[PDB]
Design an enzyme around this catalytic site. Structure first.
Site: not given
Ligand SMILES: [Cu+2]
Ligand SMILES: [Zn+2]
Ligand SMILES: [Cu+2]
Ligand SMILES: [Zn+2]
Lengths: 151, 151
Positions: B44, B46, B61, B69, B78, B81, B118, B141
């Site tokens: 993602h 961020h 995100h 999400h 998002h 995403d 992730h 993360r």
């Molecule tokens: Cu993320």
């Molecule tokens: Zn997300």
């Protein structure tokens, strides 16, 4: 938009965290750089936020107006030319720069570009030699980081 | 900007370089990540390009439309995403994503934001708990970097 941050890192001991805040038509640059030799060190925004080859891939000084290198108080300067930071005997430079040319928005935005701190002082483009008009003879790039949007 | 780049690092062994290229109204995302466990890993943009406390300071995100999400193929997602990257049995993930929502300029620009990979697969917002609708249960993360302008 109104706040940005940069974590400078390199192959050596030099590191630091730099904060940026838009105030009126200026950007306020604060923070501290550590691990430096006592004295002055060139400090500029470079064009590319590219850390694939250390600080080398950051490219040249951010210079969208195709001007010669100078100090932050000069009319003739690169947008990225923020002059010198000064490290104390303990190797710490407290950064406190108020600059009217860099921006966190628009065509002069430094978001996503690279902050670089240098081995040597910046001669502020006064030297008159070829190298001074490009880089200010600040020497090698000790540490750098990509300028990112902050909360 | 038409090109962007991100160098991912973390506290563990995960490393890689992500490239971004604008093509019309889409962004083409390519590159490689090594050191992952086999299988899927959430991936993602961020919100903040803030690495002062590792990947923790990147914020949530990137979500300028205030949605829940989802996966990149959903409208309810998002902006940041980008779903899952997949590592093989040797821990290597080849990134190949085409996305119409992220941008390298304008209001949804991800320049100066943070790319994060992730610990766990992203369940794409369909996990059935409140966490799925926030993070897709991707867990911690592992590595991240600030997205910078590339030449
Ligand atoms: Cu993320
Ligand atoms: Zn997300
Ligand atoms: Cu420089
Ligand atoms: Zn310069």
């Amino acid at each position: 938009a109104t706040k940005a941050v940069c974590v400078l890192k390199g192959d050596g001991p030099v590191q630091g965290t730099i904060h940026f805040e838009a105030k009126g038509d200026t950007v306020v640059v604060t923070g501290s750089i550590t691990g430096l030799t006592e004295g002055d060190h060139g400090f500029h925004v470079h064009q590319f936020g590219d850390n694939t080859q250390g600080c080398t891939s950051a490219g040249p000084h951010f210079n969208p107006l195709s001007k010669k290198h100078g100090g932050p108080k000069d009319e003739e300067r690169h947008v990225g030319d923020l002059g010198n930071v000064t490290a104390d005997k303990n190797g710490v430079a407290i950064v406190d720069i108020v600059d009217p040319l860099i921006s966190l928005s628009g065509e002069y935005s430094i978001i996503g570009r690279t902050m670089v701190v240098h081995e040597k002082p910046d001669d502020l483009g006064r030297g008159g030699n070829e190298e001074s008009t490009k880089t200010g003879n600040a020497g090698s790039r000790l540490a750098c980081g990509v300028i990112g949007i902050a909360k």
